[PDB]
Structure formats: C-alpha cells, structure tokens
Amino acid sequence: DPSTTDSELTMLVGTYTSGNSKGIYTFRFNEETGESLPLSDAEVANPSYLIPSADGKFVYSVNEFSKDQAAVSAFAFDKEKGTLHLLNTQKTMGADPCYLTTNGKNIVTANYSGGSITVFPIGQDGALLPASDVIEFKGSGPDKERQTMPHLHCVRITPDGKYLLADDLGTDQIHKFNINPNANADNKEKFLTKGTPEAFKVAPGSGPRHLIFNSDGKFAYLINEIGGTVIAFRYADGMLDEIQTVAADTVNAQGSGDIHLSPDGKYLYASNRLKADGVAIFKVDETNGTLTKVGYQLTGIHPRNFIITPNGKYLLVACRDTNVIQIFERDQATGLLTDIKKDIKVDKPVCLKFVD
Ligand SMILES: [Mg+2]
Ligand SMILES: [Mg+2]
Ligand code: NA
C-alpha cells in the first residue's frame, strides 16, 4: 500500500506566546525530502512543551506560567488535518510546567519554578481530570542564581514501565518513583511512590535538564544545562550507574538544552545555547554505551529543542531567537549534519514532536 503520505510526518510545534505566536503550530514534514507544509494552528498560551498520546489521537501541552495560570491543556488531534480541538485545561498548582510525559492513564508534569511534579489522571474521553498528586521537592545546589531551590525539568517513564525519573536542575538530582501501572481515573489509586533510592546524585553544579534512554533500555543519557555535560549511565532494574561524563559545551555557556539519539543508536546529539549555539555530535560505542565527540554543528540562536526523524535522515532544530526551525540532513555513516536551507518560519519555537 505505498503512499506519498508514508514519508509524510505530522509535526507539532510548541512555542512561547509573548510575541506573535498563537500557540501550537502543525505541519506536514517529509522525512525523505525535507519539504514541509503548514496545516493548522491552535490558540494556546505558552505551550512550551507538548506530547501526543501514543495512538496520536490526543495532544497534551503545558501552559508555562510563573503564577496561577500554570496548567496543562488536553486536545483531540486529527493527524491528517493537523487540527487540535481543545477538550479542557487543568491547573498544575506548580509554577512553570516545562515538560510532560504520559503512560496513557496519567499525565505527569515537571514544574520548573514550583520545584515539583504534578500527576493528572486521563479520563475515558482523553480529557484531563484535576490533579491527583502534587509532589514537592526540597534542596538547593551551588549555582548562586540557578540552584537556590529545586527546579524540575524532565519526567521520564523508564523503558521497563516500572519507574518515573525526574530531573532536578536545582538540586543536581534525578528523583526516582515507583509507578503503579494500574492507577487510573476510575480506581483513584496513587500513581507514584518514592523509590529506592529516592534519588540519584550527579556532580554539584551540573543542573540536570533532559534524560533519554537508548532503544534496548540498557543505557541512559543526561544533558546538564549548567555544567554543559552529557552523563552516560548504565540502566537496569531501576538503577542508574554513571559510566562517563563528556563535555557538550566547551565555551562555559551554561546553557545546554536538548539530547537525542539517532534511531539506529549510533550517534548522540546535544544542543547548546547562549554561546556557540549548536549541536554537539557524539559517536556511541554500541557495546559499552560510552561517547566520543565527532563533530559540531552551529545553528540558529537558542536551540532549546530539536528532533530526529524516525528514519534517521533529518535533524530539525527549533531556534527560539531566530524564529525558525532549521532542517539538517544526517550522514548516517559519520553522524555529521548538512543544512538543507528549508527553514520553517515560526515565532519562538521551543518544542518539536512527530505523529507518524
Ligand atoms: Mg522508600
Ligand atoms: Mg560547575
Ligand atoms: Na555540519
């Protein structure tokens, strides 16, 4: 059943709406040619991070606000039309939600300024129930301006479906929770409980930002915003064991951003902001999971988020300050990038996601 649509992905773009952005923008993106087409948009305030549901029928976005407007919005999504239809919104009761994840039964946010995480059950229609849990953290780190309190920046469900790991930029920790896979809107069971250990500690002043796992779930990789380092870990049965620390940033910019593995697992990419904005490229040793830097690609300004297409052919960079999504072709044998000069104009893009 080959179709033109096979290579056509639906892309969701989250933004900051302090300027001309309406909120969420949707596009068709061809992962074999790099061509794109605008589809629709949704008026949503500060949807700086969003996710599709696993079946692609729903989209959930944060509403990143410093006070009482902090929330999550739930939408019905039509992948073919690229249309978003708001279902409802619920308050996080934790300032600046900046990341979210789902297991199909609950949504979890990382509240940056609240220094907390919020759990929302998902109703039978895909809409959100009011928060069922708000988990507060305590502590600080050595950075005088950035680590005065916990700052939750990432929430990830482990590849074995058993744990939730939450990156805390403010305290140099990855908090660990046990997941109750049965917890849902109907039974009202608690989703998260503190695990053993309650947290993993990383080098002081690192500022843990985003965490990813490899395809078989035996390795994890963390990008540290302040330290500008990538930490490689061995992952097994709810344990993170540090195996290597490498420098993503080499100019002490203290603005590292996002992290992604190529789908074939052969290369790791990590972005840097503020100085020498771009993407560091590492070759992954497939057996021991360690990294060796192989290159660097300068990008537009403020690459807070990027994504790799499922076929591994393109790497798309959201450049918040240049108001563009830059498209790079990947050389699958060297990991190196080539700007194909097919930029997508978007005001303050900060989150890219695909729906197949
Ligand atoms: Mg315990
Ligand atoms: Mg330091
Ligand atoms: Na390049």
Q: Can you tell me which residue has the tokens 């039309």?
A: 81
Question: What are the structure tokens assigned to 229, written together?
Answer: 């380092």
Which residues, including other chains, have CB under 8 Å from residue 211's CB and lie 6 or more apart? 154, 156, 165, 167, 174, 220, 221, 222, 223, 259
- Spatial contact of 346 and 323, defined as CB atoms under 8 Å apart: yes
192 CA distance to ligand 1 middle (Å): 12
Burial class (CB in 10 A: 0-12, 13-18, 19+), 139: middle
Distance CA 315, CA 110 (A): 25
The closest alpha carbon to 29, from 279, 325, 337, belongs to 325
215 CA distance to ligand 3 middle (Å): 25
197 CA distance to ligand 1 middle (Å): 7
89 CA distance to ligand 1 middle (Å): 33
Strands 267-272 and 278-284, how do they pair? antiparallel
127 CA distance to ligand 3 middle (Å): 42
Q: Solved how?
A: X-ray
Give the number of the ligand closest to the Cα of residue 247: 2
- Spatial contact of 71 and 63, defined as CB atoms under 8 Å apart: yes
Distance CA 266, CA 261 (A): 8
Domain 1-356 annotated CATH 3.40.640.10: no
Q: Can you tell me which residue has the tokens 């593995």?
A: 261
344 CA distance to ligand 3 middle (Å): 19
12 CA distance to ligand 2 middle (Å): 34
163 CA distance to ligand 1 middle (Å): 13
Which residues, including other chains, have CB under 8 Å from residue 179's CB and lie 6 or more apart? 103, 157, 161, 162, 163, 164, 191, 192
296 CA distance to ligand 3 middle (Å): 7
Distance CA 263, CA 275 (A): 28
35 CA distance to ligand 3 middle (Å): 19
294 CA distance to ligand 3 middle (Å): 11
- Spatial contact of 319 and 303, defined as CB atoms under 8 Å apart: yes
Domain boundaries, the chain: 1-356
DSSP assignment of 246-299 equals: EES-SS----EEEEEE-TTSSEEEEEE-SSS-EEEEEEE-TTT--EEEEEEEE-
209 CA distance to ligand 3 middle (Å): 25
202 CA distance to ligand 2 middle (Å): 11
- Spatial contact of 121 and 81, defined as CB atoms under 8 Å apart: no
Which residues, including other chains, have CB under 8 Å from residue 145's CB and lie 6 or more apart? none
